[PDB]
Amino acid sequence: TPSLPTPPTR
Amino acid sequence: SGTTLFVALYDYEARTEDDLSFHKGEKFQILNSSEGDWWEARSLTTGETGYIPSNYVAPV
């Protein structure tokens, strides 16, 4: 974890 | 000398894969603050590198 994807545009 | 540690203002639970969790008072060296709001950092507790929300830290 964390499991969620990191958005590339952040 | 010639560098600055940062300190966490609040606890944080990371939610995405590239982000670090940390507790209030944890110390960091910042590695890249040039690519927006989320800074690349190294935790001085764990040695891990990842992104942190820049509003959660301040310079020592």
Side-chain angles (χ1 to χ4, degrees):
Chain A
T1 235
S3 69
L4 292 171
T6 302
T9 72
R10 207 205 45 181
Chain B
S1 83
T3 65
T4 305
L5 291 198
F6 278 66
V7 59
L9 299 172
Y10 325 103
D11 295 337
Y12 185 65
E13 177 184 347
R15 308 293 281 109
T16 85
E17 59 198 355
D18 291 342
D19 297 341
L20 303 181
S21 293
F22 49 87
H23 35 65
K24 180 173 175 183
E26 187 163 340
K27 305 304 188 298
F28 293 87
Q29 286 273 348
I30 306 305
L31 310 183
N32 188 346
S33 63
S34 287
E35 294 177 2
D37 292 355
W38 294 79
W39 295 354
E40 189 187 31
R42 181 187 311 286
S43 164
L44 300 180
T45 302
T46 68
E48 297 296 309
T49 67
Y51 293 113
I52 61 174
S54 58
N55 61 323
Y56 276 53
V57 292
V60 164

